[PDB]
Design a binder for this molecule. Structure first.
Ligand code: CLA
Ligand code: CLA
Ligand code: CLA
Ligand code: CLA
Ligand code: CLA
Ligand code: CLA
Ligand code: CLA
Ligand SMILES: CCCCCCCCCCCCCCCC(=O)OC[C@H](COP(=O)(O)OC[C@@H](O)CO)OC(=O)CCCCCCCCCCCCCCC
Ligand SMILES: CC1=C(/C=C/C(C)=C/C=C/C(C)=C/C=C/C=C(C)/C=C/C=C(C)/C=C/C2=C(C)CCCC2(C)C)C(C)(C)CCC1
Ligand SMILES: CC1=C(/C=C/C(C)=C/C=C/C(C)=C/C=C/C=C(C)/C=C/C=C(C)/C=C/C2=C(C)CCCC2(C)C)C(C)(C)CCC1
Ligand SMILES: CC1=C(/C=C/C(C)=C\C=C\C(C)=C\C=C\C=C(C)/C=C/C=C(C)/C=C/C2=C(C)CCCC2(C)C)C(C)(C)CCC1
Ligand code: SF4
Ligand code: SF4
Lengths: 742, 81, 73, 142, 73, 146, 73, 61
């Protein structure tokens, strides 16, 4: 069956190699005859599958690499907790979080950057932050710098431990194949073990530490004399004072009359007006139910005993009439090629990151989070960016799998075979859908702008003119606002407040959430999003499906994954490798994310965020001009892009001045990218040649023969600089604007 | 005749082009101007698609087989429709 | 005005560089010494031997028009 | 030249569902190609334009759009299973032409009998400047 | 769009579009006279440069006229 | 090639074979005028209802004349395509083989003169369909919504 | 403003066309033997020095004009 | 039955070059006449602004 088989001490911890670069690649280890060697060295370091031919060694290598990654993550967490401990105003922030700006970074007074340590309130000076740690540290009842300090220490310990574990598992006790390739027990554990018990232990930490101290702070007390956590579990009488049921030990649970615990485990829903956040009772019930669900899920597959399924015994049964034999053998494909798994997991992880970004703003989990505007905004846009990048990586590695490790002779399948057998139909129909959406979602904006600039407003696309109504969205919102009436009696309000029914939650003269109406502008922006997503999918899916062989080049696969072209023959064959398909799709994903985040910023600052008067009149941060100025590109310039770019541009000579400076460098690089994206190579090669002559004239010609970057590396550096410029520009814009006005 | 191929006496008769010719254009013929006593030849330039992969192989001083471009045709363009 | 005049001189000199490189190196450099037999505007000379994208002198004029527009702007 | 053609017959086709990589208007109006080989055993092979299919015993017959795909498949069959092959061209009049070997022996190696179409007996640097030949039909490489 | 995305991508896309239009009923009756092929490489560079210049002139010309017409001073 | 239920089925082949563009058992001019009147009845609707004079009591005649103009433009385009692609004494390029394999007479619809008859029929039919849609939309006009 | 911008952009375009057609003259009509050792054929012999010095002026002006700007900023 | 009417009431419309001539000259004449005879009620151009316009900055010039 399945056992603990491993091997002993393959590679010794000897520095013999560190002084010899490129030991892994036979060609690289010979020596740098030119300068392209030092590019090619970094370029293929992590390329494990091109260093061997057996999956055992590359599996060991990736097992060690995961430990390296985890060590870096732990070190980052430790740095964060430290800087919170020794360099923040966290205690003053806890004193009253309504109007005290979270700052967690000071700068040394050397070169005039003292102005960076701007006024943040609470007798502190420091660069304001928007990471949003403080809402978490108030949720977990840290409420003391000693806790941050010791947590940073423990994080450092875990980091060193993981680094050790890595070194040991690669060098000394290397796992074997029948361990890795055994996915049944891995699924079994990770379902039951990691996620379930994780959520369970967190529910523990919440019901036994957070809930009481948070309730006390909501009652209003200086956290100095707030009783320490362990003094809430050792002596029961405190929790007894809080929750009568909680003073009944464990009888009401075991004896199946769970309703007694109804006080601290409940299903209220909505938000908590004391902090706008979620009712921690609800989130505790959530984490606990999720723990139980993962535990009961974990027991699916047979591992050693006689019960349970087998991932081979599940696929082959499914075989429909149209497709034929079904998923037979697919189990072998997804167990014999790492790149396949990397692609699948990257896709699912990007999608989950996006849905996390979405669910965050509309249901603020933490307390006093939906009122620190910049934090909410920055979190949402960061998660969106991460999701986009993960998705593109998924597509790229899927293409790499399609090229290298796919083969019908032994890694056969009858499903993917059919899929590839009609690729042309797929790409054609997706292309036509892309054209259709492009037309009927952007030409609408063009028509609206034109009919505006021609003095014919009553022929526009808006509520006051020829009208388009997003009826399905309002239908769903009505349903979600009337569902807690009959369908979900156990709830108290709608699942969130953004559903089109209820009241508004406002703390400290500022609003946090309220109903959200949808106008024709929302219809148009949603169709823009749909179109751009469809085009990115078109690019990447075409790349994957045509990575093997196209009707232009018959044997593309033999030429490898990443090569620049196939010469200028047959009318020119530039950018045919799947690698170049990903190079293209990157820009379109960037554009999709950019327009999405702009739409989000405008919609929030024009319909939700803002301040509330003493009487109750709302005056939003931007005045609520969305439904009347999002329908013209010229509007986007005037109402949003130009106007709300003030705070970044007057930012010189103030605390926010750093956000100003980047706003130029971001643009600059942004420029710079074109120089690599537009030019070619031969020109630069000849220029380098003349420069080498000019040097050689002075007996300075270096033996590391200069060489203009190879084509693929040129495109890579170009796209990297371009993404950097764009993202840094929107980053500076967002931070400066929101943290200045809000 | 759409494109055009040329071969020059710096041919060392190493025979990499033919092995890398995608559409069966070149071949070798008995010569007396190298050890291998064989030089290139292009009697099938009609199907010459135009990719430089052939002369991307010739490891001579500068080159020994050139691919000069010209007008276009239906087969010199990889057309399949 | 001094700083702007210096930027203008930068643009002038670099655009001149682009065009003069396109002119003198048109007959051929060590990357393609027999370029003078390919006529003026050609796609390229193959992806091998280091890659030869944007090597025609037409391509030099191409890469110069950008800087011309920039300097005049 | 004792190197006669083989006059491609009509023999069965490989087992394949038929897919969007087949022929188009071009093949039906201008020209197409047919590759033919004898196989040692029913195995699996990836067609040039999509997916994979199985071959049969004895001689095979596959049709394709352009010569490049045929020759790519032939090089695959020669480097993967060590079998010989031919491929023929067809015209809508009914003509059939024999293209690849032209003697039976690969063009990879020497076989006297081939003429010398397109040689220049001078190094590459000896070519002349277009001004010396302008306003004429001639070019430098001729 | 023309300075970045080079030909082969669009060539394959045109291949797919050609097959599509070919195997579609009610349109296969209508034939084409020139086989659709994506533009050449130097042709790409040229049209991309033309677009760049046209935009970079229109933008600044309209701005220059408007900024001093709205104020005349 | 692939043959899904879409591209291959009794009802779909039946329908596509019954519409005028393939029933070779009729004169090409008549198929042309039939498709013309079809598209004529077709296009009047949105052009009229959503035109730039819809808020005016003339919107009917306006949309109808616009439809007629578009029909005329497309008939011009048809004749132009025909004179471009079809020579005047050369053979046809229509599919002369059916599904079974019955060698079909070269479709006179796919001839220069046949294409000309088709174009003329289509133009006349489009005009008739447009005026018919007008007379049925602005005289006998109860059971509709517009 | 309109007239000044007009004439300046036209001058820039013509100036680019000048070197373009010069490179064309070298590619198509320059004869070696009819120009042996003359100033024209004397230019080509040291194109490297010219290109290098133009690149040096470009690098100097660029580096310092960008440095000063970033410092002031 | 209907075939004879369809033939006769569109009989001169069969010659193709004649057809191009007729369609083009008729379209030109028709559009020229309808635009020259455009009524101001349906076209905001066939009538003037009919209001006192605004003076530009710096007086009037
Ligand atoms: C998350 C960061 C990260 C991690 C975990 C790794 C992990 C690894 N890299 Mg690595 N690498 C990275 C980023 C990373 N890389 C980056 C950004 C670059 C620049 C492009 C490189 C360039 C690089 C090269 C050039 C090489 C590696 C190699 C390795 C492997 C052995 C390194 C080792 O044991 O050092 C241990 C170091 C310490 C314990 C402390 C040193 C301080 C290992 C899989 C080597 C390899 O895989 O060769 C087969 C190798 O030669 N890396
Ligand atoms: C993600 C990791 C990370 C990063 C980017 C920084 C970054 C920085 N640290 Mg730092 N630091 C980290 C982890 C990190 N630290 C950890 C884990 C510790 C605990 C050992 C410290 C302890 C530390 C001290 C004690 C000091 C810094 C200081 C600094 C700044 C110089 C710079 C902003 C200095 C600083 O900002 O002083 C105000 C300084 O004096 N760091
Ligand atoms: C679909 C499952 C799911 C959902 C919707 C949430 C939702 C949320 N989690 Mg949770 N989490 C989950 C699974 C999930 N989690 C699992 C499997 C583990 C293990 C964790 C461990 C975890 C921790 C440690 C924390 C959260 C926190 C949060 C809140 C932010 C919310 C945070 C929280 O409790 O907010 C106060 C928090 O600190 N989660
Ligand atoms: C956890 C996910 C993950 C993992 C394990 C890998 C791992 C790998 N990727 Mg990959 N990739 C990912 C995410 C990931 N990537 C994502 C999200 C994208 C989309 C942006 C890509 C896009 C991508 C491409 C396009 C290519 C790879 C390649 C590779 C392989 C070689 C790595 C290399 O050359 O970089 C070495 C390290 C560097 C070059 C450092 C770059 C640092 C950046 C550019 C600076 C800017 C950061 C601020 C390696 C197996 C390459 C490959 O397989 O080559 C054959 C390849 O061509 N990947
Ligand atoms: C996205 C596709 C699209 C759609 C569905 C419409 C739809 C319409 N347009 Mg239109 N239009 C579009 C794009 C589009 N437009 C673009 C891109 C332009 C600029 C080139 C115009 C310029 C335009 C004009 C100038 C006019 C219309 C008019 C009309 C109406 C007839 C109808 C509502 C007409 C109208 O307003 O009638 C109500 C009209 O006079 N359109
Ligand atoms: C924007 C799209 C659009 C619009 C606004 C119209 C508008 C109209 N159509 Mg219509 N139509 C359209 C697209 C459109 N069509 C398309 C794509 C088809 C398919 C060919 C049809 C087929 C059609 C028929 C068959 C009929 C209409 C008719 C009508 C009219 C009355 C509709 C009613 O009350 O029922 C009205 C002017 C009716 C009418 O009397 O037209 C004047 C009628 O009988 N339409
Ligand atoms: C924007 C932008 C910028 C800044 C440049 C800059 C340059 N181009 Mg260029 N170019 C651009 C766009 C741009 N281009 C575009 C869009 C095109 C059209 C394709 C071209 C086409 C083009 C051609 C055709 C040529 C140039 C040339 C040049 C150089 C001229 C010499 C000079 O002034 O040096 C200025 C130098 C700089 C601006 C570099 C300094 C950058 C910083 C200061 C470096 C240090 C940063 C940091 C501290 C170090 C660490 C960084 C990192 C480790 C974190 C220069 C490097 C010419 C050349 O090669 O000249 C010799 C040349 O032949 N470019
Ligand atoms: C609904 O699909 C349902 C249909 C059912 O197919 P089968 O029952 O043969 O497939 C069994 C599944 O388990 C997939 O293997 O899927 C297909 O026929 C494939 C083609 C989908 C065609 C989608 C067109 C858009
Ligand atoms: C995504 C991500 C993140 C997050 C993360 C997290 C948050 C995680 C969590 C995790 C978790 C949450 C985990 C948990 C775990 C748990 C465990 C691992 C447990 C264990 C346990 C045990 C082992 C026990 C045992 C026992 C005892 C001792 C008693 C009872 C009985 C028994 C025997 C069972 C961040 C952003 C940061 C970064 C990036 C990435
Ligand atoms: C101080 C002063 C003065 C003087 C002035 C002067 C004297 C000036 C000069 C100036 C100059 C002196 C300028 C120059 C310029 C130049 C240029 C601008 C050039 C150009 C060139 C080119 C364009 C070339 C072309 C070509 C080529 C490329 C190759 C060969 C062919 C050809 C020739 C075509 C006076 C006393 C009177 C007065 C006061 C002030
Ligand atoms: C001092 C010096 C100099 C100069 C320099 C310069 C002039 C510079 C510039 C620069 C510029 C003109 C610009 C820049 C820019 C930069 C940037 C722009 C960066 C960035 C970075 C980062 C790291 C970012 C990041 C991020 C974001 C923000 C987004 C996404 C997320 C993350 C976090 C990744 C000279 C030569 C005299 C000499 C040497 C030294
Ligand atoms: S060119 Fe290179 S490859 Fe072709 S024949 Fe002469 S030597 Fe052999
Ligand atoms: S030049 Fe650069 S891009 Fe154009 S084909 Fe040759 S390699 Fe591909």
């Amino acid at each position: 069956e399945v056992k603990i088989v491993v091997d002993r001490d393959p590679v010794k911890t000897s520095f013999e190699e560190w002084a010899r670069p490129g030991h892994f690649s036979r060609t690289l280890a010979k020596g740098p005859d030119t300068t392209t060697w030092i590019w090619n060295l970094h370029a293929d370091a992590h390329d494990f599958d091109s260093h061997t031919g057996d999956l055992e060694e590359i599996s060991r290598k990736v097992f060690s690499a995961h430990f390296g990654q985890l060590s870096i993550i732990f070190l980052w967490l430790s740095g964060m907790y430290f800087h919170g401990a020794r360099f923040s105003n966290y205690e003053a922030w806890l004193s009253d979080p309504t109007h005290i700006g979270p700052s967690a970074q000071v700068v040394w007074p050397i070169v005039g950057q003292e102005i960076l340590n701007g006024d943040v309130g609470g007798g502190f000076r420091g660069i304001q932050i928007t990471s949003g740690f403080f809402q978490l540290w108030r949720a977990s009842g840290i409420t003391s710098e000693l806790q941050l300090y010791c947590t940073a220490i423990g994080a450092l310990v875990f980091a060193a431990l993981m680094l050790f574990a890595g070194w040991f598992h690669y060098h000394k006790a290397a796992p074997k194949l029948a361990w890795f390739q055994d996915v049944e027990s891995m699924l079994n554990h990770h379902l039951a073990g990691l996620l379930g018990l994780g959520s369970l232990s967190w529910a523990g930490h919440q019901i036994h530490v957070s809930l009481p101290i948070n309730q006390f702070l909501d009652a209003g007390v200086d956290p100095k004399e707030i009783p320490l956590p362990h003094e809430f579990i050792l002596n029961r009488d405190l929790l007894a004072q809080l929750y009568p049921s909680f003073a009944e030990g464990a009888t009401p649970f075991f004896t199946l009359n769970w309703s007694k615990y109804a006080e601290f485990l409940t299903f209220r829903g909505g938000l908590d007006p004391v902090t706008g956040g979620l009712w921690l009772t609800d989130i505790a019930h959530h984490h606990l139910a999720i723990a139980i669900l993962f535990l009961i899920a974990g027991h699916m597959y047979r591992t050693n005993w006689g019960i349970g399924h087998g991932l081979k015994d599940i696929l082959e049964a499914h075989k429909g009439p149209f497709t034929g034999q079904g998923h037979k053998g697919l189990y072998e494909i997804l167990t014999t090629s790492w790149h396949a798994q990397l692609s699948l997991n990257l896709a699912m992880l990007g999608s989950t990151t996006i849905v996390v970004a979405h669910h965050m703003y509309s249901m603020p989990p933490y307390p006093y989070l939906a009122t620190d505007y910049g934090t909410q905004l920055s979190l949402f846009t960061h998660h969106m960016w991460i999701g986009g990048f993960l998705i593109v990586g998924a597509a790229a590695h899927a293409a790499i799998f399609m090229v290298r490790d796919y083969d019908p002779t032994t890694r056969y399948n009858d499903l993917l075979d059919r899929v590839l057998r009609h690729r042309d139909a797929i790409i054609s129909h997706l292309n036509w859908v892309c054209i259709f959406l492009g037309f009927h979602s952007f030409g609408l904006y063009i028509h609206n702008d034109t009919m505006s600039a021609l003095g014919r407003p009553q022929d526009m696309f808006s509520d006051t003119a020829i009208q388009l109504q997003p009826i399905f969205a309002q239908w769903v919102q009505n349903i979600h606002a009337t569902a807690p009436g009959v369908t979900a009696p156990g709830a108290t309000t709608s699942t969130s407040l953004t559903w089109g029914g209820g009241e508004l939650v406002a703390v400290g003269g500022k609003v946090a959430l309220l109903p959200i109406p949808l106008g024709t502008a929302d219809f148009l922006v949603h169709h823009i999003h749909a179109f751009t997503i469809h085009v990115t999918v078109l690019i990447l899916l075409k790349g994957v499906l045509f990575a093997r062989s196209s009707r232009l080049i018959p044997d593309k696969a033999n030429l490898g994954f990443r090569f620049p072209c196939d010469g200028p023959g047959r009318g020119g064959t530039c950018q045919v490798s799947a690698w170049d398909h990903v190079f293209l799709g990157l820009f379109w994903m960037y554009n999709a994310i950019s327009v999405v985040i702009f739409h989000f910023s405008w919609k929030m600052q024009s319909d939700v965020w803002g301040t509330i008067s003493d009487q109750g009149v709302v005056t939003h941060i931007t005045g609520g001009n969305f439904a009347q100025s999002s329908i013209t590109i010229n509007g986007w310039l005037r109402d949003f892009l130009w106007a709300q770019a003030s705070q970044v541009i007057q930012s010189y000579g103030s605390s926010l001045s750093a956000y100003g400076l980047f706003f130029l460098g971001a643009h600059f690089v942004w420029a710079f990218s074109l120089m690599f994206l537009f030019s070619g190579r031969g020109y630069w090669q000849e220029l380098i040649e003349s420069i080498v002559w000019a040097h050689n004239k002075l007996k300075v010609a270096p033996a590391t023969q200069p060489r203009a970057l190879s084509i693929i590396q040129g495109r890579a550096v170009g796209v990297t600089h371009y993404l950097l410029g764009g993202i840094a520009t929107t980053w500076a814009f967002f931070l400066a604007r929101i943290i200045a006005v809000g | 005749m759409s494109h055009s191929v040329k071969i020059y006496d710096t041919c060392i008769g190493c025979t990499q082009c033919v092995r890398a010719c995608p559409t069966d254009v070149l071949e070798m013929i008995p010569w007396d101007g190298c050890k291998a006593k064989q030089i290139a030849s292009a009697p099938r330039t009609e199907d010459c698609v135009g990719c430089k992969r052939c002369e991307s192989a010739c490891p001579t001083d500068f080159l020994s087989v050139r691919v000069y471009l010209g007008p276009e045709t239906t087969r010199s363009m990889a057309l399949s429709y | 005005d001094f700083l702007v005049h210096h930027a203008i001189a930068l643009g002038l000199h670099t655009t001149t560089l682009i065009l003069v490189k396109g002119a003198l190196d048109a007959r051929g450099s060590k990357l393609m010494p027999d370029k003078k037999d390919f006529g003026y505007s050609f796609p390229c000379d193959g992806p091998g031997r280091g890659g030869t994208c944007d090597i025609s002198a037409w391509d030099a004029f191409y890469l110069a028009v950008f800087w011309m527009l920039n300097t005049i702007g | 030249g004792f190197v006669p053609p083989q006059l491609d017959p009509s023999t069965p086709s490989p087992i394949f569902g038929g897919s969007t990589g087949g022929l188009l208007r071009k093949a039906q109006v201008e020209e197409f190609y047919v590759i033919t080989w004898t196989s040692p055993k029913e195995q699996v092979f990836e067609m040039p334009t999509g997916g994979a299919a199985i071959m049969r015993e004895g001689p095979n017959l596959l049709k394709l759009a352009r010569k490049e795909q045929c020759l790519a498949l032939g090089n695959r069959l020669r480097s993967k299973y060590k079998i010989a092959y031919q491929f023929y061209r067809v015209f809508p009049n009914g003509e059939v032409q024999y293209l690849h070997p032209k003697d039976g022996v690969y063009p990879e190696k020497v076989n006297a009998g081939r003429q010398g179409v397109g040689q220049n007996f001078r190094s590459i640097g000896k070519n002349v400047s277009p001004i010396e030949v302008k306003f004429t039909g001639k070019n430098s490489f001729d | 769009m023309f300075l970045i995305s080079w030909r082969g991508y669009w060539q394959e896309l045109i291949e797919t579009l050609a097959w599509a239009h070919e195997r579609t009923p009610l349109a296969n009756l209508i034939r084409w006279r020139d086989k659709p092929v994506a533009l050449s490489i130097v042709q790409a560079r040229l049209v991309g440069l033309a677009h760049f210049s046209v935009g970079y002139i229109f933008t600044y010309a309209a701005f220059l006229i408007a900024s001093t017409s709205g104020k005349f001073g | 090639s692939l043959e899904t239920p879409v591209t291959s089925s009794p009802l779909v082949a039946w329908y596509l074979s019954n519409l005028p563009a393939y029933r070779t058992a009729v004169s090409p001019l008549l198929r042309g005028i039939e498709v013309g009147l079809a598209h004529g009845y077709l296009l009047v609707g949105p052009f009229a209802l959503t035109g730039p004079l819809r808020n005016t009591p003339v919107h009917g005649q306006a949309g109808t004349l616009g439809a007629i103009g578009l029909v005329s433009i497309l008939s011009v385009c048809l004749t132009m395509y025909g004179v471009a692609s079809f020579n005047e004494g050369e053979p046809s390029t229509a599919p002369v083989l059916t599904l079974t394999g019955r060698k079909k007479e070269a479709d006179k619809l796919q001839t220069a003169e046949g294409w000309s008859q088709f174009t003329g029929g289509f133009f006349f039919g489009g005009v008739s369909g447009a005026v018919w849609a007008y007379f049925l939309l602005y005289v006998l006009d109860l059971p509709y919504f517009f | 403003a309109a007239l000044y911008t007009h004439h300046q952009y036209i001058a820039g375009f013509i100036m680019t066309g000048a070197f373009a057609h010069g490179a064309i003259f070298f590619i198509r009509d320059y004869n070696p033997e009819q120009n042996e050792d003359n100033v024209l054929a004397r230019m080509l012999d040291h194109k490297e020095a010219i290109i290098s010095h133009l690149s040096w002026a470009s690098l100097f002006l660029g580096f310092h004009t960008l440095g000063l700007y970033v410092h002031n900023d | 039955l209907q075939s004879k009417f369809f033939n006769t009431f569109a009989a001169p419309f069969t010659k193709r070059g004649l057809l191009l001539k007729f369609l083009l000259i008729g379209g030109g004449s028709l559009v020229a006449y309808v635009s020259a005879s455009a009524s101001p009620d349906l076209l905001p151009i066939k009538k003037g602004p009919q209001l006192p316009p605004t003076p530009g900055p710096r007086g009037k010039i």
